[PDB]
Design a protein around this ligand. Structure first.
Ligand SMILES: Nc1ncnc2c1ncn2[C@@H]1O[C@H](COP(=O)(O)OP(=O)(O)O)[C@@H](O)[C@H]1O
Ligand SMILES: Nc1ncnc2c1ncn2[C@@H]1O[C@H](COP(=O)(O)OP(=O)(O)O)[C@@H](O)[C@H]1O
Ligand code: SF4
Ligand code: SF4
Ligand SMILES: [Mg+2]
Ligand SMILES: [Mg+2]
Lengths: 274, 274
């Protein structure tokens, strides 16, 4: 068995930092993981690979001629803890659909046997500001059974979580894609944990972890490293270990209950965030 | 003559708050303005209309049968200072292309004569996290000659500004779409103004205004109002008046010079933001 998970959320919310640190913690535990980058920013694997970023399947297929001329062993790269890494890529801005590389990449990985029985987890790191094209494909085509949404007390981040949840509902008649939890990536605001707990309850899920804002993240990332590798004794490393443990142990996977803008605004007003 | 302007930027950066306040300041000056909402969030006109939001062209065409059964005078709504307002709308998450409503809306406005000679400005408020589909249409189809990008010292906001600039470059062989400036919507961080000035210089544009972070915005918006209308004496009202004046007087419209991720990271490192 292997658990296919996707991390969604609005841009800049902390998807890639949270995913790579969570996965490093899983590898530290003994799990075999692969990360599939599904964001055109294409820096979703750099902290595992100690790298600037990673060359993308779209880039690599173009140099090889066709995606058929690519070999999986040339594409997947292993970094910290043996974690395997790949980036989808996408067309340049203003050219075609920003999500088109995700479809090509996931199909390539499936055909070439990347989903080896020894893997324990796959994590897709997916742009979540729009839920369409290749960005919706992990949900529409039943690729990620467990969706975790990174958000914060920011209205836009909660709105994005609600929109992703609407996408999950739309495809619930087929497949088994479910909402597994919200991850609050703290803005260091008061009552933010309570706000995200309340949002999760309205959606029917849970706040699986509250990730604190901590400067050690920036110091690790300047050195192209997860906190797990950079400073295994840091408080923040233990936070990512707690998130990883709760993901491993999580059994709540629901069809969520999207809320109205009225309910979103009411949540914001109640917890004094405004 | 009328100047067609578009406000782009990543989600949550301040596009709609900045646009509606800028436009209220223009109306206060005596300008005739229309705002075209091009973001699926569809709350780009609520502060002009004193409203929850505005029903969208996609919603309204569906109830009327066809977009041909819609009348412009039923669609455009006027609020503070006579500013005219319309929302494109878009499909639900997971359904088709998130930007498809923008194409329908702009074509409807053009055919129905919305671009009356008496208008001084049109502002499109456009989602900027992906530059594709209907979100690229104002650039691809030469609808907004002057692009202003709202950003901040946040790496993701600067990355988005760079991506939008790449879209402008891609279509520079036709039409007259140009980058008019960056608007820094402050995160209250040190050297943020200098950082955005430096980014603008590398792109070949300017920082047209630094908008401070000010709680009066939240107090105005709780009451569904621009700061201009809510408290015309507020310091922040004068900030939006300064932005509006500089937009009116701006003559620098360039084909920008997009930068590398290496240059973006170097900017961040230099100004001590990290
Ligand atoms: N818990 C945290 N503490 C401190 N900084 C963080 C934290 N989470 C994310 N960041 C910083 O926020 C920025 C954006 O995070 P990232 O994961 O790249 O977002 P996304 O992938 O959602 O666009 C990065 O500079 C990252 O280092
Ligand atoms: N200069 C500012 N000072 C205080 N709050 C602001 C400012 N600009 C924006 N905001 C707040 O930031 C949030 C997001 O702004 P908004 O314009 O809706 O972003 P976007 O349209 O880019 O998604 C809103 O709650 C808004 O009130
Ligand atoms: S939103 Fe991007 S192409 Fe449809
Ligand atoms: S990105 Fe949305 S549909 Fe192409
Ligand atoms: Mg990322
Ligand atoms: Mg907006």
């Amino acid at each position: 068995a292997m658990r296919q998970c996707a991390i969604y959320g609005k841009g800049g919310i902390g998807k890639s930092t949270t995913t790579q640190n969570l996965v490093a913690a899983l590898a530290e535990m003994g799990k075999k993981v692969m990360i599939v980058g599904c964001d055109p920013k294409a820096d979703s694997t750099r902290l595992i690979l100690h790298s600037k970023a990673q060359n993308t399947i779209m880039e690599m297929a173009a140099e090889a001629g066709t995606v058929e001329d690519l070999e999986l062993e040339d594409v997947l790269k292993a970094g910290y803890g043996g974690v395997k890494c790949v980036e989808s890529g996408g067309p340049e801005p203003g050219v075609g659909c920003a999500g088109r590389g995700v479809i090509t990449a996931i199909n390539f990985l499936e055909e070439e046997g990347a989903y080896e029985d020894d893997l324990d987890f796959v994590f897709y790191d997916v742009l979540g500001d729009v839920v369409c094209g290749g960005f919706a494909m992990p949900i529409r085509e039943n690729k990620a059974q467990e969706i975790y949404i990174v958000c914060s007390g920011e209205m836009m981040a909660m709105y994005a979580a609600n929109n992703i949840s609407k996408g999950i509902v739309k495809y619930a008649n087929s497949g088994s894609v479910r909402l597994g939890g919200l991850i609050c990536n703290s803005r260091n605001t008061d009552r933010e944990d309570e706000l995200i707990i309340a949002l999760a309850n309205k959606l029917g899920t849970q706040m699986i972890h509250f990730v604190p804002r901590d400067n050690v993240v920036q110091r690790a990332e300047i050195r192209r490293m997860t906190v797990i590798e950079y400073d295994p004794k840091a408080k923040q490393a233990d936070e990512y270990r707690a998130l990883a443990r709760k993901v491993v142990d999580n059994k709540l996977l629901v069809i969520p209950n999207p809320i109205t803008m009225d309910e979103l605004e009411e949540l914001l007003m109640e917890f004094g965030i405004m």
